[PDB]
């Protein structure tokens, strides 16, 4: 990445930052029990609030049965067809059966407990975790229930509680993201799902794990329970991976507004220079937390442009003021002073910009007071290299992003081609 010699074109590289990837996962098994346990007589409203839940899970036991494609009757030694997006999806689900005899052993126990979260486990690292439905607040309403004196007029507080909880449910269950599951119980993933190297977390790491996709693998109607196999990540600080955000401004050419159409982000990884689609990664203070390696190679032009030789960059034509005309590059200010008024020091001292130059760099304290179409500021430092004026940057590659213009232009290219052969 070459940041200098690039501001003079309207490409404004921004904020070198690190990169982290979730290349491997440490799976667990969440076992939600959607019924609370009451520790005194009966709550007369339990049956009715139970009946409300019967509408949801009864849809789910055939939401899985009759949906499984039986991609793996072979067990990790009439499949028809299935892709790697499912191979890894169900091979990880193949591991559920070997733990099915294990998870079921807990399901026989959590049924009779009165505790919100239990992290019972077998292996040294892996641990299954049991989460009850509203047992957190149940202990905070059965304790007042001694004051309210009743299965109801007391269980009414439970009655509204589960209905509200039911109102919370069916929202993300109506591919679930981990945020919803934590949302029901007001808890957070660093309290229940953190062990060994999967324990020390940042604040940005916390949100990335909550953004991963959680899979449902089993529903038992009798227990009203749902089995969730999460994939907790291990984020290694991938080396030599800098992700520079890129912005563009209206590089003027002969009173017409043009800009260089770079992608949302660009990376440098050794020789790799192609951009990225960071629509999925959680941004950190000094790094990017990506599930995969989002890097996709750019064109030769947009990769030769970002290593300099700006005499290769694509040159789109501006339509609608989505691209800016002025931005604060370092302490100083860079602007397209032909279209927007810059004026330097004196508010009335509207500075002329030559018609053959795109953006005029205002830095090195030539204008200690700068007013962009109004307003006032004070440049500091490092926005230029001694008012660095480059050569006549002649941009050749003018590209249009609408398919109509491309089609129309080649129609002319097709038409004269027929005329050209004679």
């Amino acid at each position, epitope marked *: 990445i070459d940041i200098t010699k690039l501001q003079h074109v309207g490409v404004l590289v921004n904020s070198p930052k690190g990169m982290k990837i979730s290349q491997n996962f440490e799976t667990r098994y969440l076992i939600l029990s959607l019924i609370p346990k009451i520790e005194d007589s009966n709550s007369c409203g339990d049956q009715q609030i139970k009946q409300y839940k019967r509408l949801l899970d009864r849809l789910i036991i055939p939401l899985y049965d009759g949906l499984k494609l039986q991609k793996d009757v072979i067990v990790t030694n009439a499949l028809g067809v299935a892709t790697s997006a499912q191979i890894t999806a169900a091979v990880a689900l193949v591991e559920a059966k070997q733990a099915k005899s294990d998870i079921e052993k*807990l399901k*026989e*126990a959590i049924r009779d*407990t009165n505790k919100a979260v239990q992290s*019972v486990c077998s292996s*040294v690292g892996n641990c299954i975790v049991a989460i009850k439905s509203v047992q957190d607040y149940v202990n905070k309403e059965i304790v007042p229930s001694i004051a309210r004196l009743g299965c109801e007029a007391a269980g009414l507080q439970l009655g509204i509680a589960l209905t509200q909880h039911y109102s919370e449910l069916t929202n993300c269950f109506g591919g679930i993201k981990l945020q919803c599951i934590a949302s029901l119980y007001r808890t957070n993933i660093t309290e229940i799902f953190t062990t060994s190297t999967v324990d020390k977390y940042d604040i940005y790491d916390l949100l990335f794990t909550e953004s991963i996709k959680v899979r449902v693998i089993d529903v038992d109607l009798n227990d009203y329970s749902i089995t969730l196999q999460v994939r907790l990540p291990l984020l290694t600080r991938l080396l030599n991976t800098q992700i520079y955000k890129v912005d563009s401004i209206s590089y003027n050419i002969q009173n017409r507004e043009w800009y260089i159409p770079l992608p949302s982000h660009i990376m440098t990884k050794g020789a790799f220079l192609g951009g990225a689609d960071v629509k999925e990664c959680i941004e950190a203070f000094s790094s990017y937390i990506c599930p995969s390696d989002p890097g996709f190679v750019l064109n030769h032009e947009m990769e030769s442009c970002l290593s300099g030789n700006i005499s290769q960059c694509p040159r789109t034509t501006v339509t609608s003021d989505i691209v800016p005309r002025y931005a604060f590059v370092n302490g100083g200010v860079v602007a397209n002073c032909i279209t927007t008024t810059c004026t330097c020091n004196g508010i009335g001292n509207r500075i002329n910009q030559p018609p053959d130059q795109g953006v005029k760099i205002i830095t090195h304290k030539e204008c200690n007071t700068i007013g962009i179409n109004g307003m006032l500021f004070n440049t500091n430092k490092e926005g230029t290299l001694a008012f660095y004026t480059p050569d006549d940057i002649t941009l050749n590659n003018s590209v249009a992003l609408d398919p109509i213009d491309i089609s129309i232009e080649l129609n002319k290219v097709k038409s004269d081609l027929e005329e050209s052969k004679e």
Partner: antibody
Amino acid sequence: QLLESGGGLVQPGGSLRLSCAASGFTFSSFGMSWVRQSPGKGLEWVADISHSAGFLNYADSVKGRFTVSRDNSKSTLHLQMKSLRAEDTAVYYCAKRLAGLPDLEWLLYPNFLDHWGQGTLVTVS
Amino acid sequence: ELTQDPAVSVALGQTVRITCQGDILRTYYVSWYQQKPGQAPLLVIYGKNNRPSVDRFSGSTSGDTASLTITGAQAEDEAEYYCSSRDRSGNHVLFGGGTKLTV
């Protein structure tokens, strides 16, 4: 905690029913387990029971020929014996798993047998 | 099944180590058992912790082997050690041959 009842004298191909009562012990809240010890050898694995009757796990000669029954009402653990032949002459201890409802952290481990009862005698003539 | 040393003997003191190795214990805890000959066995080490009745010995789990290390010798320890583990699948339990010990 004390757990043993004893009583057994049979003939090859016969039947028997061992039992053990866990006095001063939360029988329903805690799992159960039996272990066989040949007189000339070490210990070995026979049958497992959960806190409830939901899961019965057996390894009787690595197959199914015995049935062990749990009863929470009288807090006794019963194992049904039948068709003994050349492989069962040993002593039997009634055992209780360490884990349970109050402390489920070790529920997934069925070999953490906390306290063992006195050995009972069986014979294959 | 997991195995161990058939037997071992020492003098009346110093310290003693008991080994254990097999196709298991790589990702599973260990449960060392002693029984005085003619009596029901007792648990000494469940997981990495120790039973309070036992302090005197705690053992050490390794990557592929288990090891229970004990020190001293008294009117105790004249009995063999059984090294046990949870089954690979989670259904059975496995027991090794007793390592007869004399002070």
